[PDB]
From a paper:
In order to assess fine details of the molecular structure of DimC33, two crystal structures of DimC33 were determined to 1.9 Å and 1.4 Å resolution, hereafter named DimC33_low and DimC33_high, respectively; additionally a crystal structure of DimC33 in complex with ThT was determined to 2.8 Å resolution, and named DimC33_ThT. The three crystal structures display three different space groups and crystal packings. The electron density is of excellent quality and all β2m molecules are completely traceable in all three structures. The monomeric components of DimC33 most closely match the conformation of wt β2m as observed in its physiologic class I major histocompatibility complex. The only noticeable difference occurs in the DE loop (residues 57–60) that displays a slightly modified conformation so that Trp60 participates in stacking interactions with Phe56, of the same chain, and with His51 and Tyr66 of the second chain within DimC33; the rotation of Tyr63 side chain of about 90 degrees is also observed. The covalent DD strand interface is structurally well conserved in all three DimC33 structures, where it maintains the same contact surface of 560 Å2. The superposition of DimC33 with previously reported β2m dimers, non-covalently associated through the DD strand interface, shows a very similar overall monomer-monomer orientation and conserved conformations for the residues involved.
Physiologically, β2m is degraded in the kidneys; DRA patients typically suffer from kidney dysfunction that results in β2m accumulation in the serum following dialysis. Therefore, the unprompted dimerization of [name] implies that in solution, under native conditions, the DD association interface spontaneously brings together two monomeric β2m molecules, and only once the DD interface is properly assembled, the two facing Cys33 establish the disulphide bond, which results in the formation of the covalent dimeric species (DimC33). In summary, our study presents an engineered β2m covalent dimer, DimC33, displaying the same biophysical properties of wt β2m in solution, such dimer mimics the first oligomer formed during β2m aggregation.
Author numbering:
A (entry chain A), B (entry chain A): 0 to 98
Amino acid sequence: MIQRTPKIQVYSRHPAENGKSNFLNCYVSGFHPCDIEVDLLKNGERIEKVEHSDLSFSKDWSFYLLYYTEFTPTEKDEYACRVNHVTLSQPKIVKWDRD
Amino acid sequence: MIQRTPKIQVYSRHPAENGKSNFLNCYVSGFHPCDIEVDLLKNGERIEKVEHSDLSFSKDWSFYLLYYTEFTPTEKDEYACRVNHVTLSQPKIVKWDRD
């Protein structure tokens, strides 16, 4: 019933190797309420065709959600996850750290 | 982004036969926002140990959720689903109709 911020984790399925296909993930967890906005960013631009899990919840009413997309890294491409939620004073951008 | 009421469907896996195990379902669908309260009722009392699906959503941001429980009907037991949601002026109780 009380608001709780999301934990935000941005990570790839494998370590970044340029020119090899991979999956980019944004896992948002432990939040309340369920209303949340999650985008994956490529060089600061929203990625349009992104996949997501369902929104799961535990008996303490905390929520869990994953956004992800197949992608091929190149050295100069930068990726991030942008989250907005009522508990956040500003939308949060968390960068993908390749290593 | 606009609020939309849930559709509420209450149904059993098989037609009610007293003394035989069954599953009771409350499927709540097409709603927005995601914040929702769903209870299964036995003779007007909340059933405590109930199972649920995850909350799924389509690209139009409508949500879908199922609550369910294994149960054994007897002739006099009455079952229902109680839903509360911001779009509802009162909590809604939808009865299970055995046939």
